[PDB]
Amino acid sequence: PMFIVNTNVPRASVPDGFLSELTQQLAQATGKPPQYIAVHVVPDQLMAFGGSSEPCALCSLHSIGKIGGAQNRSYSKLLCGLLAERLRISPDRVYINYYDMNAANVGWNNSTFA
Template identity: 60%
Template sequence: MPMFVVSTNVAKSEVPAALLSEATEELAKALGKPAEKFAVHVNADQMMMFGGKGDPCAICSLTSIGKIGSDYNKQYSKLLCGLLNKHLGISPERIYINFVDVDATNVGKNYTTIG
């Protein structure tokens, strides 16, 4: 159920499909979870400013059942900032990422919850 959601002011036409597939593959490795369970969502063309400037920026969240915390988050931050810089040209200094650890009973799927 891991989810990576990106909101960015980068134009949709500038978002390559490779970002979504690479994020899925790399996050699956980093979290040790199957790629088939991952969801990646990019909200492009958002009206956003970061530090009072309209340069490319992103606000993100990485949500997972477990594998979130001080032992992991710096690694994820490095990975995700690198991907957003590589594919969207966003400076890592203009990216915020929230890491969210959820209980399996708080995630719904297929008419029920995961836990």
């Protein structure tokens, strides 16, 4: 899977080891192997949520499967919790878009997963 976090929180407030923690936690939550997990954090962004420039985050999780009603609720609770605890962003200032990818539409290692 691929998880991206865009936030207006400054780079210095992203703690050491945050990307590894995201990798390991997504491994547990999605059940996917850590070797297949890519994570991307983008701090210092020019963003607003509800018109306010208070800390916020816009995120996306793309995955071949393991996307669905109940699963996405669980990811949101896990990921919002991480963003609140580590980046001090309130969960009502976080959007996470979920994408269930067809294997034919994910390229990796000169091929696709299909």
